[PDB]
Design a protein around this motif. Structure first.
Motif, short mmCIF file in Angstrom:
data_model
loop_
_atom_site.label_atom_id
_atom_site.label_comp_id
_atom_site.label_asym_id
_atom_site.label_seq_id
_atom_site.Cartn_x
_atom_site.Cartn_y
_atom_site.Cartn_z
N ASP A 189 7.88 -7.94 2.84
CA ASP A 189 6.57 -7.29 3.07
C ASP A 189 6.28 -7.31 4.57
O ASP A 189 5.99 -8.41 5.10
CB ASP A 189 5.49 -7.99 2.26
CG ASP A 189 4.12 -7.34 2.38
OD1 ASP A 189 3.87 -6.59 3.36
OD2 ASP A 189 3.32 -7.52 1.43
N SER A 242 9.34 0.89 11.82
CA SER A 242 8.13 1.69 12.13
C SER A 242 7.76 2.56 10.93
O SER A 242 6.75 3.25 10.97
CB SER A 242 8.38 2.52 13.33
OG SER A 242 9.50 3.37 13.11
N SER A 243 8.58 2.53 9.89
CA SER A 243 8.43 3.38 8.69
C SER A 243 8.94 2.58 7.50
O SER A 243 9.87 1.80 7.69
CB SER A 243 9.15 4.70 8.83
OG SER A 243 8.69 5.60 7.86
N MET A 244 8.32 2.76 6.33
CA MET A 244 8.69 2.11 5.06
C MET A 244 8.90 3.22 4.03
O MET A 244 8.12 4.17 3.95
CB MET A 244 7.60 1.16 4.56
CG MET A 244 7.55 -0.19 5.27
SD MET A 244 6.98 -0.04 6.98
CE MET A 244 5.26 0.38 6.69
N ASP A 294 3.79 -6.63 6.18
CA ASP A 294 2.41 -7.09 6.51
C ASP A 294 2.33 -8.61 6.35
O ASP A 294 1.43 -9.19 6.83
CB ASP A 294 1.34 -6.36 5.69
CG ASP A 294 1.22 -4.88 6.01
OD1 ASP A 294 1.18 -4.55 7.19
OD2 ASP A 294 1.19 -4.06 5.07
N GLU A 295 3.30 -9.20 5.65
CA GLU A 295 3.34 -10.65 5.39
C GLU A 295 4.21 -11.29 6.47
O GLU A 295 3.90 -12.39 6.87
CB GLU A 295 3.93 -10.87 4.00
CG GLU A 295 4.13 -12.33 3.68
CD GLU A 295 4.33 -12.66 2.20
OE1 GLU A 295 3.51 -13.40 1.69
OE2 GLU A 295 5.30 -12.20 1.59
N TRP A 311 0.84 -1.23 0.00
CA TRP A 311 0.00 0.00 0.00
C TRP A 311 0.86 1.27 0.00
O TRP A 311 0.29 2.33 -0.03
CB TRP A 311 -0.93 -0.03 1.22
CG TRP A 311 -0.22 -0.34 2.51
CD1 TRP A 311 -0.12 -1.55 3.12
CD2 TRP A 311 0.51 0.59 3.33
NE1 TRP A 311 0.60 -1.43 4.28
CE2 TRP A 311 0.98 -0.13 4.45
CE3 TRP A 311 0.77 1.96 3.25
CZ2 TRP A 311 1.71 0.46 5.48
CZ3 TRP A 311 1.47 2.57 4.28
CH2 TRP A 311 1.93 1.82 5.38
N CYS A 312 2.19 1.16 0.08
CA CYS A 312 3.12 2.28 0.39
C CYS A 312 3.75 2.81 -0.90
O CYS A 312 4.55 2.09 -1.56
CB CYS A 312 4.21 1.82 1.34
SG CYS A 312 5.43 3.10 1.71
N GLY A 313 3.38 4.04 -1.27
CA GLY A 313 3.89 4.71 -2.49
C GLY A 313 5.42 4.78 -2.53
O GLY A 313 6.06 4.34 -3.48
#
Lengths: 104, 174, 174, 104
Positions: free
Chosen positions: D57, D71-73, D59-60, D30-32
């Motif tokens: 990922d 805490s940041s991507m 979230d995976e 989801w991260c641009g």
């Protein structure tokens, strides 16, 4: 001139005054439109002295607001013999005035 | 499995806050309303329900709920959908702000529902355990036609997947 | 009563999402962080905590949290406050969006904390029962100086009152 | 050229390759900024073939991301002998390139 109802018993007693028109302004302290209609309702109360005017804080007496299905503020509900005749939703002076005039 | 059986509404209820076109143009003061699931389904012939783990969460915000808003006009006008219900366990004020941040202008055919304590969502087994007795909704979709569940599917991996719960999958079963 | 006793952090934790000045100017992808209450209080000499029933709820949004944002610079610069923690039971994404909608640009000295299941807030007796085993935070404020609670107060009537929980009351005890 | 780690065991095995530089791009779908740095990382991988490049990922494989305190991507973490030497936060090509160059 507009009397705040601070409990269910006050609301019940107000609606039981009977025969003549009872108007209740359901308002919230955080609600801009509430604060705008308020002086308007006071002036309608001085005009139409044949009707009894009240206000009720939906956050203070939430059981009465929920049973009256108030989902938006302002809501003025018009009562006769303890029973609703009509209601006006929103800060709509002319609509409220017309609702009083034809129900007083 | 819920498919081809009566919608198990029971005595379950949800809270939502209405949005009308007058709003985001004027100042409004809307409060939560309580809706009995049983009444929503008996009053509405064609109901889509989708579950979302968390209002404002990025996967839901970016990859899941926008599709339902994008297709809403099509669902209502072309596919005769009466209600789209987005279900979270989030408070109704937070859900309403999420709907508005996503461009919802009118709750006539779309409502962002609060399922307090995840009670309804747990009842149909579509919950997401997030630890120490706390449950969020999983990511899921359901179609109810004349009070009968025609389509019901939950994401196995809600962290990564918007597949069987997507608006596209729902469109395929209408 | 908590006043003049050690902050009862125990093993309680909260989640929050950081905000930095780079955001609301650039695109960012922040995730929840877990903070042990014990670490927050041992790392920070002067901590204000305020409880809010619901992110985006009108009383909280209009009449309660804005004061803490309005006084934040004063609390930090004049009154040597290290952290202001706004506590709700809402998911951390919803809390972060609420903070940004309220004008928070930087979480260095202010953090919107998720207390999942209301576990910490119930532990100090400051919860609000909202029915069928569901608890939101009440509206409350607390001051912790060198790990000791100097000020603790809950609203009796959180529906109507922002008195003892207001930033103004807090300022009076600093 | 950039290998996706799809489980903890894959991540552990990648970090245990040992001696040479291991780089892991922690991203979200989801991260641009994730989607923007991705081709950039592929081109750094073709350049600096003395280092092994991976993506994960968050979230995976959330347990690995949380232990790594992502805490940041994007977050690129640089590992040597299974241990972090440095990390670069944000879609910062020049900063990532400099971090590779002085650690390869």
């Amino acid at each position: 001139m507009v009397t705040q109802l601070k409990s269910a018993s006050e609301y019940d007693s107000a609606l039981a005054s009977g025969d003549k028109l009872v108007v209740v302004d359901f308002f919230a302290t955080w609600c801009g439109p509430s604060k705008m209609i308020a002086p308007m309702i006071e002036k309608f109360a001085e005009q139409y002295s044949d009707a009894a005017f009240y206000k009720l804080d939906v956050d203070e007496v939430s059981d009465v607001a929920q049973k009256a299905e108030v989902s938006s503020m302002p809501t003025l509900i018009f009562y006769k013999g303890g029973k609703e005749v009509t209601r006006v939703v929103g800060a709509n002076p002319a609509a409220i005035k017309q609702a009083i005039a034809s129900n007083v | 499995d819920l498919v081809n059986k009566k919608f198990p509404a029971g005595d379950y209820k949800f809270q939502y806050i209405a949005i009308s076109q007058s709003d985001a143009d004027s100042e409004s003061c809307k409060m939560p309303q309580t809706v009995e699931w049983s009444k929503l389904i008996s009053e509405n012939k064609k109901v889509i329900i989708t579950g979302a783990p968390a209002a404002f969460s990025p996967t839901c915000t970016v990859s899941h709920i926008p599709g339902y808003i994008n297709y809403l006009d099509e669902l209502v006008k072309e596919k005769e959908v009466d209600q789209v219900i987005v279900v979270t366990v989030d408070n109704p004020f937070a859900n309403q702000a999420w709907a508005k941040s996503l461009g919802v202008k009118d709750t006539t055919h779309i409502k962002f529902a609060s399922d307090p304590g995840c009670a309804f969502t747990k009842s149909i087994g579509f919950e997401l355990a997030v630890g120490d007795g706390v449950y969020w909704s999983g990511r899921w979709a359901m179609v109810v036609e004349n009070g009968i569940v025609t389509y019901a599917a939950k994401e196995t991996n809600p962290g990564t997947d918007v597949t069987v719960s997507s608006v596209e999958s729902v469109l395929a079963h209408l």
